[PDB]
Design a protein around this ligand. Structure first.
Ligand SMILES: [Mg+2]
Ligand SMILES: [Mg+2]
Ligand SMILES: [Mg+2]
Ligand SMILES: [Mg+2]
Ligand SMILES: [Mg+2]
Ligand SMILES: [Mg+2]
Ligand SMILES: [Mg+2]
Ligand SMILES: [Mg+2]
Ligand SMILES: [Mg+2]
Ligand SMILES: [Mg+2]
Ligand SMILES: [Mg+2]
Ligand SMILES: [Mg+2]
Ligand SMILES: [Mg+2]
Ligand SMILES: [Mg+2]
Ligand SMILES: [Mg+2]
Ligand SMILES: [Mg+2]
Ligand SMILES: [Mg+2]
Ligand SMILES: [Mg+2]
Ligand SMILES: [Mg+2]
Ligand SMILES: [Mg+2]
Ligand SMILES: [Mg+2]
Ligand SMILES: [Mg+2]
Ligand SMILES: [Mg+2]
Ligand SMILES: [Mg+2]
Ligand SMILES: [Mg+2]
Ligand SMILES: [Mg+2]
Ligand SMILES: [Mg+2]
Ligand SMILES: [Mg+2]
Ligand SMILES: [Mg+2]
Ligand SMILES: [Mg+2]
Ligand SMILES: [Mg+2]
Ligand SMILES: [Mg+2]
Ligand SMILES: [Mg+2]
Ligand SMILES: [Mg+2]
Ligand SMILES: [Mg+2]
Ligand SMILES: [Mg+2]
Ligand SMILES: [Mg+2]
Ligand SMILES: [Mg+2]
Ligand SMILES: [Mg+2]
Ligand SMILES: [Mg+2]
Ligand SMILES: [Mg+2]
Ligand SMILES: [Mg+2]
Ligand SMILES: [Mg+2]
Ligand SMILES: [Mg+2]
Ligand SMILES: [Mg+2]
Ligand SMILES: [Mg+2]
Ligand SMILES: [Mg+2]
Ligand SMILES: [Mg+2]
Ligand SMILES: [Zn+2]
Lengths: 135, 53, 97
RNA sequence: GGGGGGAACCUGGGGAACUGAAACAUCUCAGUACCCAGAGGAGAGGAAAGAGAAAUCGACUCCCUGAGUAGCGGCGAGCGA
RNA sequence: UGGUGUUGGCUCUUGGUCGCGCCUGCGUAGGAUAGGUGGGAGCCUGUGAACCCCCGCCUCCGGGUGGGGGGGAGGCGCCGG
RNA sequence: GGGCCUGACUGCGAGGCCUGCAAGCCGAGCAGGGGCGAAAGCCGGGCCUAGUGAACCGGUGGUCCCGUGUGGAAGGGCCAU
């Protein structure tokens, strides 16, 4: 709960739902450190965690990539989620909203299971708060 | 029939339709009945499998 | 239980239909009627006492039209009602319908 | 101004059973008989929040037809637009 | 006899579940109170360390966490058993 | 008794037996796709005569025939059980 963690607490409306072409203009003022920062995108799924066929296996990435075409991995847990890199702290805007736009539609391409596959998709930096957005 | 001598259908394993109805003793024949038979849809002989009636 | 003084709702004659079986929608053979007899359906009559022009007026009204009474009371603000007996007061209220 | 009367007719409020189903209960008889209230020389109804397939008709009533058709129905007896 | 209408005021103890936060999770090798998977070589401090004063507490009795009064520069992880 | 096998076939069926009706019974032969046999051929359950239940209502699988202005959908028809 750091000096920079709560100095992003008035750079964030945690009670506001954003769009994708507006949540890349608000992850550069949330990512300011002495080293580089992986702005992490996360998401809640909608399948049965003990049904062996309803798993999420695969890779992406593109158009752009990682940062250090950077095929980023993304896999689920034993209670349903994702947790995947990256689109770090610039990596310019509208090329960060363009690298954050062809990855949300990646995992939705690996579905007849039960429950809407689109829940909560939060985009947070290495050292910042969480933006609700729209997947 | 009886409780132990049941009625059953034979389903064409290719087009999954039921073409035949027959009986078996499930103490004598616990396994699913498997038989080749003429499917009127497929117009050829096809292994047919016992499915519940 | 009789008739509503506002709406005029009277008891109606209705059937009690006794049924048996599983509806066809639920995969059953269907409903069999094991008895039809006549009963009545009464209005939800209640007592409504209201003070109008110092007199205590009471209506026998169906609960459905309870507010309609209070409406009538408000409509009685511009009426020469003073001095009148409760009976003729109610007549004036009723005549506002 | 009302009250009461009028053979039958009419509308409204209520409303059977025998019987038929070759037993009976849903169904039938039948919204009939009957009781009640009201109307009049008639009464009801009546100017589309309608029909229903005609891209159509055009208030209501009454007769002919549509038709024992469409349907309803312990899909029975029968009922019937 | 349940629900509901007629049928209202106040208070207390409450509960379903919706979100959110702060937390609770100890079979066995073991620094030692390991929820599930993951990102990540920096993080936490003039938004005040390390040891103390009252601790809201829980705790498989070893421990886990939080506030302020003392309180002025470390801790926590990399590494890797 | 033993090999291979699923004809305990699909689509029909001349002709009869029996017979108040409705049923019940036997059936050569043609086509489809098969089994067995070198072949003639045989195979539409069981040496035979009992081991059963008309319609009505409804379930399941097909079919994709009807679909209440039109596209659907509800519902139903047909084949099978
Ligand atoms: Mg058969
Ligand atoms: Mg057998
Ligand atoms: Mg066919
Ligand atoms: Mg009832
Ligand atoms: Mg019925
Ligand atoms: Mg009252
Ligand atoms: Mg109400
Ligand atoms: Mg008169
Ligand atoms: Mg009448
Ligand atoms: Mg009458
Ligand atoms: Mg009586
Ligand atoms: Mg009777
Ligand atoms: Mg009789
Ligand atoms: Mg008789
Ligand atoms: Mg008798
Ligand atoms: Mg009748
Ligand atoms: Mg008279
Ligand atoms: Mg008169
Ligand atoms: Mg009139
Ligand atoms: Mg008009
Ligand atoms: Mg005209
Ligand atoms: Mg009738
Ligand atoms: Mg009660
Ligand atoms: Mg109540
Ligand atoms: Mg032999
Ligand atoms: Mg043998
Ligand atoms: Mg043999
Ligand atoms: Mg062979
Ligand atoms: Mg065959
Ligand atoms: Mg013949
Ligand atoms: Mg005959
Ligand atoms: Mg027979
Ligand atoms: Mg042949
Ligand atoms: Mg041959
Ligand atoms: Mg051969
Ligand atoms: Mg041959
Ligand atoms: Mg033959
Ligand atoms: Mg027989
Ligand atoms: Mg019957
Ligand atoms: Mg049927
Ligand atoms: Mg069609
Ligand atoms: Mg056909
Ligand atoms: Mg239609
Ligand atoms: Mg069509
Ligand atoms: Mg329609
Ligand atoms: Mg359409
Ligand atoms: Mg159907
Ligand atoms: Mg259908
Ligand atoms: Zn087939």
């Amino acid at each position: 709960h750091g000096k920079r963690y709560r100095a992003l607490l008035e750079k964030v409306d945690p009670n506001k739902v954003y769009t994708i072409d507006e949540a890349a203009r608000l992850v550069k003022e949330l990512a300011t450190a002495k080293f580089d920062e992986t702005v992490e995108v996360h998401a809640k799924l909608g399948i049965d965690p003990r049904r062996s066929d309803q798993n999420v296996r695969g890779t992406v990435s593109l158009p752009h990539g990682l940062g250090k075409a950077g095929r980023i991995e993304f896999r689920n847990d034993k209670t349903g989620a994702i947790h995947a890199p990256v689109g770090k702290a610039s990596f310019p805007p509208e090329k960060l909203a363009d690298n954050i736009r062809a990855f949300i539609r990646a995992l939705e391409a690996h579905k007849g299971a039960k429950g809407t596959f689109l829940r909560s998709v939060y985009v947070t930096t290495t050292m910042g708060p969480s933006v609700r957005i729209n997947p | 029939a009886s409780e132990v001598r049941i009625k059953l259908l034979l389903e064409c394993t290719e087009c999954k339709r039921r073409n035949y109805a027959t009986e078996k003793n499930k103490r004598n024949t616990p396994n699913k009945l498997e038989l080749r038979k003429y499917c009127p849809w497929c117009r050829k002989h096809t292994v047919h499998r016992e499915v519940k009636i | 239980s009789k008739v509503c003084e506002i709406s005029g709702k009277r008891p109606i004659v209705a059937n009690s239909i006794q049924r048996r079986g599983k509806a066809k929608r639920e995969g059953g053979v269907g409903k069999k009627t094991t008895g039809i007899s006549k009963r009545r359906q009464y209005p939800n009559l209640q007592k409504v006492r209201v003070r109008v022009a110092g007199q205590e007026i009471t209506f026998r009204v169906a609960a459905s039209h309870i507010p309609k009474v209070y409406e009538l009371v408000e409509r009685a603000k511009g009426l020469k009602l003073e001095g009148l007996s409760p009976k003729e007061i109610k007549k004036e209220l009723l005549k506002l319908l």
